[PDB]
Design a protein around this ligand. Structure first.
Ligand SMILES: COCCN1CCN(c2nc(SCCc3ccc(OC)c(OC)c3)c(C#N)c3c2COC(C)(C)C3)CC1
Ligand SMILES: COCCN1CCN(c2nc(SCCc3ccc(OC)c(OC)c3)c(C#N)c3c2COC(C)(C)C3)CC1
Lengths: 46, 33, 1037, 200, 100, 100, 50, 50
């Protein structure tokens, strides 16, 4: 029942922190996802 | 519980007793008694 | 027709609730164990020929039996042995999948082809033919605390009172003793037989005759004389019931009554069947049960009642007898039966958090909290019709499936929640207005899930039994998680809801979540600026993707293809191995030290040491010995330093200090024959008839040659025993009879003094117990005591053995194993740590080419599993790859259309391969399920993203470049509500260690930090997977 | 005590009776085995005599109308009826002289239960009994369960044979109505589209 | 011809003591008597295959036979699926009295 | 033939009967069994019967449960364990030659 | 009427079928011969045939 | 084969062929016992067969 005392305070801190590392992923590396710019497609079969 | 020997050894020789797995012929010996 | 259950909606509501108790009757019918039947069905034939070496009991027993075994069905490798205590144990590892009960009796009653050809002592002693491998349920050490009872004094109390009563209890299939019971150990004093001019013949010939129940007749019997009125039954000579009554077993008396009682030539006392096993439990002597499952495995009711039936025995214990459990299956699963339910309830809350994430409601959010506990107990119920059991391979299989039942729960209420949130229409039609265009796509919400079990029937063997335990688990997690998601959950979008404003983005939401719901708007434009900028970079992000998978095989070749991890199973087996021909006094003296070492230097970890002198899993004898070591619960000891491998490796260091014994230890799986994790186990054969010493020089040449390749063949050791000395007697026949003796008087003297001969049975306390004549200890203990045995001549003048029995020493291997009907030796082996076994298996063959004529080479254990299949990963997960191509092409209705959903297979395995770096685990089977759990859901998002692009091609008519730019933009608000819909379910899988952690913390971060490649990193590339298909195969030009 | 407890209810329990037979007298023959060796006889001349004359002993097969039938040695009937017929059996010593069984074998009498009925390795005593004319087994078996729980712990009561299947009917046959009709209590809501029509 | 106090001990207690964990068992009752007859009755769970039963009884007896003092089987033992229902129990009698 | 039939038996039959797929291997010869050819004008020389030829071969050619030096239980104070080889089953025509 | 006339309704298992036979067993004193037990089955057969 | 086997005296040499199941012979060949019941031995059974 104390792990529902855990998941009162650690399902409200370990749910936003995994929500915060993905923000360090999808927005921190999301900027460098748009620094890369170029065209290199091989459209030869069409 | 002791073998009696008539030949093969001389007096004062150092019989290995304990450890005949880990002792192949030609190893350093921590020869306690 | 999906709405045939919706057109009256409670026609769909109740059918799931029918499963809640028509499965609920079968979840209490369903029995518990930690492990299913992994092992191939083995048959252990335990012959016993007491007081005879290997080459005797290879020839008298083993070769006779192995000649018969030709006409039996479906063997893998009929491994054997024959050792110096007189025991045969041939093991018929059969084929997996085929049953045991038919297959046991096919080798059990054609052991009756030559039961008479066995000598009439070994078929007077035992040929016990079990259908079980080494899967014990528990071991029950019975222990004397005081010291009144000796070791063997325990063992009949176990036999006469417990073994039958414990085998009464349900779930119990096989019961052994490490005893067994009070055989009347007739000793012999050969300086008392010579007093009375006897031999061990006349002690046997008396006890075989004066101790024999007679068909005693009946007074007034059948027929009566006509006129009979009396009927009784005669008691003739009863089987004598006492150590004192064998005392007055008569011998030669003269005609004037000068008797010879047998207590004048025998120190008569009770004893054992064999004293080959001196157990020990914390320095004081023990007996012990060994309890196995009944087929139809039961561990909840069994060990709870094995204890409970044992609770009627502490009134019956004699002075200081205690019961202790050095081993038990169940406390591995006595806690996971509650916590994996308790992790699930917070996982329900973790999915109720998803309803609490954007909705933040209290009545329209009960839908997953009722959608979940239907599916979990129905999951038991269908496999309860399959007959399989809840287990640590299946309860773990459904703690994953409660991520795989919620991932269809909160995508189809939230698609309904999506459709009602741009035009504002009520959910009574949004349960159809969502389904009106994707009715050929909820046959698709489990269709790659239809494609990840069709080779899970197609693994065979020991590991092939593991994938079947996740197979039907992800089929019930396919079927009754979608038959509550195509039928129930669209009907669940009608009643308990709070419908919304005109296209609710969340206008009137007031909270710090609601301002973070505008960082839900941070990824609105940016993830559109991602894919819009990925479309500008579509030539350099095309060519980027094939070289973020160059690290896949670069990690996978250095990710070592190992087997199942060493669980801290709460015990670890400590093996001792003394010099060749070291006696049982020395081994107990070494097991005095090793017990004193595991106690007085590891009090905190080791509960106790159940130490058996003389037992060797490598092979019984006197120079060997095992210490079953009881560990403790992790509530009593912390940390990695108190796990098994840290305990054993500290142990083996100090075992370099213990001289006169090559002590080490190891850990246990269920099976003890799984190899060396690059495992090969090897049976080098004799073919020609070279004997064994010419086969031994082959061992001396290839174990040396194994030591000539440390680069490939690292461990050079056989499992057997070094060629001990054994003591030839030249019974000099021609001398002996001329001396005046007969030969059958010699061998019944020699074979019942020095051996110990079974004679017949006697009756102690109304129980049938053996009678072993044997020489006393101090008279059979040296080569000098040959001459103290006196054998009767033709006339009755006594003759010493030393008059006619010269003697000499010679070798002999006191445990000879056999290839199937030919001699062999158990060569172990490991490939060098972090290499393949296929080259280490093949190098041994072309190093057995360095070995002479008449020498075959074969495999056993998991090596014959390797002999049938090297690795069934590349070509039989192609039928988890090609079978994905056929199924999802039916959805999009185009050839080469699933080439978009094939490019989430690398973005699901790289998350699996990176969790082997941030924790450092290897390739096991639970990593192989780590693929299919993560590429099982990398594909479903890769359906949900680009099948709405089929709506943007077969309902909406946008151009496929900008339909993808609508498959990022219309799809946008479910994007954070699909990828985060599952990955909030994987949360407790980091800080939970102890009792097999790496299935749920490395594969846990193979599914927490492993699904990030599949959820928050794949979906950047998933929409442009649609156009990289549909810019080369464009049917728009 | 059971027939002191269960046969004294003669209205319902009609003819509660045992199966395991009362302790018959058995005829112990003390082969006074030292005399049975000092006289010169080997005892295997005695136990084969005492146990293949009184006993009846298989010897071998023989052929009879082309069929294999057994060969039984036994005493003729009027030479094994009484304890007097102990004294007529003659055994041969070492030196070929003949000795009677009454010269050494001192007979006596003792108890003995012939039907030593066991149970899984536990000796037992089976008890039969019917129910009353016009009444049933369940008002007689549970009546026995009023009279079988009277005993303390140490000698227990088991219900098997015909008695297991009614002990199994007592555990599932009225309990059959629960899980049958609750599915019917849930069949109606599929048919009638309400939780409340299964109230009716 | 044998007794009953030690027909359980020559025959029955041996065949009883091989009965390690009987496959889907309910009770094993035996009854030695004064004619030297033993009827060990192994009754199993219903629904468990009677065909494998008579196989497995002689894989419980013939699990561990030669813990038999071997005259146990030398006298002649007969494992049998005794569903003690009969068909017709045909009696064959003599009418005049010449045949015994 | 018989010089061949054991070579089938001692080498081939135990290698073909576990060659893959193979069920029952029925050998068509024999193993190379020691064939004592008695000679009744040598028996009448030595005044024997085939009984005494059988009684001798069942005795001198009989493997014996020979026991162990250092066997179980030990005397308190022991350091040696070996096994005993008694009469091995005799391995030759030349060793049946010196069957006494 | 249901709840009172169900636990008071006698709960048998199977009725006695008129199977056309019925076994009559005899039980003599402990140690009575095959002559005497036949002598009672003289009477019992004479009972069931008069 | 069998025609030249008429020349071989001292032996009723013949030959045949193997079907899938080899107990019939010439495509319809029946097979039949003649059992003895009354304990007549074998020669009177043989005189029945002769
Ligand atoms: C020849 O014996 C074959 C039986 N082997 C497998 C079962 N086994 C095991 N025995 C024991 S406890 C002792 C049983 C015993 C008692 C007296 C003995 O001497 C009479 C004896 O040796 C014969 C064994 C335990 C534990 N804990 C385990 C195994 C088996 O491994 C576990 C780690 C499961 C724990 C004993 C060895
Ligand atoms: C164990 O013996 C009984 C087996 N029977 C059925 C099979 N049958 C057959 N046996 C043989 S080989 C006989 C080998 C042999 C060698 C030494 C012997 O001296 C000991 C011996 O005597 C037994 C036989 C063949 C062929 N080719 C065939 C059949 C049968 O027809 C075929 C066309 C298959 C060819 C032989 C008789």
């Amino acid at each position: 029942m104390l792990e529902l005392l855990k998941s009162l305070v650690f399902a409200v801190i370990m749910v936003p922190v995994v929500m915060a590392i993905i923000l360090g992923l999808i927005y921190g590396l999301g900027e460098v996802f748009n620094i890369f710019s170029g065209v290199g497609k091989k459209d030869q079969p069409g | 519980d002791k073998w009696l020997v008539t030949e093969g050894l001389k007096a004062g020789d150092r019989v290995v007793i304990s450890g005949l797995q880990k002792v192949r012929p030609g190893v350093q010996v921590k020869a306690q008694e | 027709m999906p709405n045939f259950f919706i057109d009256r909606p409670i026609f769909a509501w109740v059918i799931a609730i029918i499963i809640m108790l028509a499965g609920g009757l079968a979840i209490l019918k369903l029995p518990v164990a930690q492990y299913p039947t992994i092992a191939p069905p083995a048959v252990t034939i335990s012959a016993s020929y007491p007081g005879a070496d290997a080459k005797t009991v290879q020839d008298t027993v083993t070769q006779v039996i192995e000649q018969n075994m030709n006409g039996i069905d479906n063997l893998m490798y009929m491994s054997s042995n024959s050792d110096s205590t007189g025991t045969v144990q041939i093991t018929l590892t059969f084929e997996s999948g085929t049953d045991a009960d038919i297959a046991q009796v096919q080798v059990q009653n054609k052991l009756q082809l030559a039961m008479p050809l066995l000598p009439q002592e070994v078929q007077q002693q035992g040929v016990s033919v079990e259908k079980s491998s080494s899967s014990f349920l528990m071991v029950v050490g019975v222990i004397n605390t005081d010291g009144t009872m000796t070791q063997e004094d325990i063992s009949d109390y176990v036999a006469a009172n417990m073994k039958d009563a414990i085998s009464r209890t349900s779930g119990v299939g096989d019961v052994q003793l490490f005893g067994s019971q009070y055989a009347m150990r007739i000793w012999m004093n050969p300086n008392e037989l010579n007093k009375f001019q006897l031999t061990p013949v006349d002690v046997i010939t008396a006890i075989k005759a004066q101790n024999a129940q007679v068909a005693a007749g009946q007074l007034g019997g059948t027929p009566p004389v006509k006129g009979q009125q009396l009927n009784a039954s005669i008691i003739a000579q009863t089987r004598l019931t006492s150590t004192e009554e064998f005392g007055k077993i008569l011998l030669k008396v003269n005609q004037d009554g000068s008797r010879v009682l047998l207590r004048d030539v025998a120190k008569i006392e009770l004893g054992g069947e064999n004293y080959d096993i001196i157990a020990e439990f914390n320095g004081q002597p023990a007996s012990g049960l060994g309890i196995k499952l009944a087929t139809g495995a039961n561990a909840l009711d069994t060990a709870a009642a094995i204890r409970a039936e044992l609770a009627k025995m502490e009134p019956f214990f004699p002075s200081g007898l205690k019961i202790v459990y050095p081993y038990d299956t169940t406390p591995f699963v006595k806690i996971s039966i509650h916590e994996v339910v308790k992790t699930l309830v917070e996982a329900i809350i973790l999915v109720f958090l998803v309803m609490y994430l954007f909705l933040q409601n209290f009545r329209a959010t009960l839908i997953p909290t009722i959608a979940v506990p239907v599916v979990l107990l129905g999951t038991f119920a269908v496999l309860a019709a399959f007959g399989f059991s809840i287990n640590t391979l299946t309860m773990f299989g459904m703690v994953l499936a409660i991520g795989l039942l919620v991932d269809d729960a909160i995508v189809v209420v939230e698609n309904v929640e999506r459709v009602m949130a741009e035009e504002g229409l009520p959910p009574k039609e949004a349960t159809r207005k969502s389904m009106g265009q994707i009715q050929g796509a909820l046959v698709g919400i489990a269709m790659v899930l239809s494609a990840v079990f069709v080779p899970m029937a197609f693994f065979g063997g020991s590991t092939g039994a593991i994938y079947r335990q996740f197979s039907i688990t992800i089929v019930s997690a396919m079927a009754l998680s979608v038959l509550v998601a195509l039928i129930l959950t669209p009907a669940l979008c009608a009643t308990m809801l709070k419908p919304i404003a005109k296209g609710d983005h969340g206008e009137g939401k007031k909270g710090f979540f609601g301002w973070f719901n505008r960082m839900f708007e941070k990824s609105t434009h940016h993830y559109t600026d991602s894919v819009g900028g990925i479309l500008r970079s579509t030539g350099r992000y095309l060519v980027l993707y094939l070289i973020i998978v160059v690290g896949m095989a670069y990690l996978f070749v250095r990710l070592p293809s190992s087997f199942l991890p060493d669980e801290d199973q709460g015990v670890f087996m400590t093996m001792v191995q003394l010099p060749a021909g070291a006696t049982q006094e020395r081994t107990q003296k070494v097991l005095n030290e090793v017990t004193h070492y595991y106690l007085t230097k590891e009090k905190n970890n080791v509960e106790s040491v159940f130490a058996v002198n003389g037992f060797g899993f490598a092979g019984r004898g006197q120079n060997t010995g095992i210490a079953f070591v009881s560990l403790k619960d992790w509530a009593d000891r912390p940390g990695e330093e108190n796990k098994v491998e840290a305990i054993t490796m500290r142990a083996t260091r100090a075992f370099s200090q213990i001289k006169d014994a090559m002590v080490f230890a190891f850990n246990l799986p269920a099976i003890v024959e799984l190899g060396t994790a690059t495992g090969f186990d090897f049976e080098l054969i004799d073919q020609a008839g070279l004997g064994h010493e010419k086969l031994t020089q082959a061992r001396n040449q290839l174990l040396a040659e194994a030591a000539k390749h440390p680069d490939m063949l690292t461990s050079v050791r056989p499992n057997g025993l070094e060629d001990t000395p054994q003591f030839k007697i030249d019974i000099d026949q021609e001398k002996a009879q001329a001396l005046g003796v007969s030969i059958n008087d010699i061998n019944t003297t020699l074979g019942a003094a020095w051996g110990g001969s079974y004679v017949n049975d006697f009756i102690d306390r109304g129980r049938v117990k053996k009678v072993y004549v044997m020489s006393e200890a101090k008279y059979r203990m040296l080569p000098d005591d040959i001459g103290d045995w006196y054998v009767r001549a033709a006339d009755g003048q006594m003759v010493p053995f030393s008059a006619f029995s010269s003697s000499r020493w010679e070798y002999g291997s006191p445990r000879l194993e056999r290839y199937n009907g030919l001699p062999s030796m158990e060569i172990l082996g490991q490939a060098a740590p972090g290499k393949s076994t296929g080259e280490a298996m093949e190098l041994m063959e072309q190093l057995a080419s360095k070995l002479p004529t008449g020498v075959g080479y074969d495999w056993t254990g998991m090596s014959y599993q390797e002999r049938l299949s090297g690795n069934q990963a590349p070509s039989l997960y192609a039928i988890s790859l090609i079978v994905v191509f056929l199924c999802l092409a039916a959805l999009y209705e185009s050839w080469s259309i699933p080439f978009s959903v094939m490019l989430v297979v690398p973005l699901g395995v790289i998350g699996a391969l990176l969790a082997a770096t941030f924790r450092g685990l290897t390739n096991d089977v639970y990593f192989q399920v780590g693929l299919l759990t993560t590429i099982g859901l990398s594909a479903k998002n890769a359906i949900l993203i680009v099948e709405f692009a089929k709506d943007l091609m077969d309902k909406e008519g946008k151009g496929l470049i900008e339909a993808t730019l609508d498959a990022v933009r219309m799809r946008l608000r479910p994007i954070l509500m699909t990828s985060l819909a599952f990955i909030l379910g994987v949360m407790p899988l980091v800080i939970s260690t102890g009792a097999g952690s790496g299935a749920q913390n490395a594969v846990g971060t193979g599914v927490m930090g492993g699904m990030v490649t599949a959820t928050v990193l794949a979906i950047f590339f998933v929409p442009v997977f649609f156009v990289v298909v549909r810019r080369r195969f464009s049917r728009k030009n």
